[PDB]
């Protein structure tokens, strides 16, 4: 769990 994982999670569950 890394960089674009935090781009997608910024959209998906806020983490």
Curated annotation (Swiss-Prot):
Highest taxon of source: Eukaryota
Subcellular location: Secreted, Extracellular space, Surface film
Coiled coil spans: none
Note: Pulmonary surfactant consists of 90% lipid and 10% protein. There are 4 surfactant-associated proteins: 2 collagenous, carbohydrate-binding glycoproteins (SP-A and SP-D) and 2 small hydrophobic proteins (SP-B and SP-C).
Record's disease association: Pulmonary surfactant metabolism dysfunction 1: A rare lung disorder due to impaired surfactant homeostasis. It is characterized by alveolar filling with floccular material that stains positive using the periodic acid-Schiff method and is derived from surfactant phospholipids and protein components. Excessive lipoproteins accumulation in the alveoli results in severe respiratory distress. Respiratory distress syndrome in premature infants: A lung disease affecting usually premature newborn infants. It is characterized by deficient gas exchange, diffuse atelectasis, high-permeability lung edema and fibrin-rich alveolar deposits called 'hyaline membranes'.
Subunit structure: Homodimer; disulfide-linked.
Function comment: Pulmonary surfactant-associated proteins promote alveolar stability by lowering the surface tension at the air-liquid interface in the peripheral air spaces. SP-B increases the collapse pressure of palmitic acid to nearly 70 millinewtons per meter.
Protein name stated in the entry: Pulmonary surfactant-associated protein B
Species whose genome carries this gene: Homo sapiens
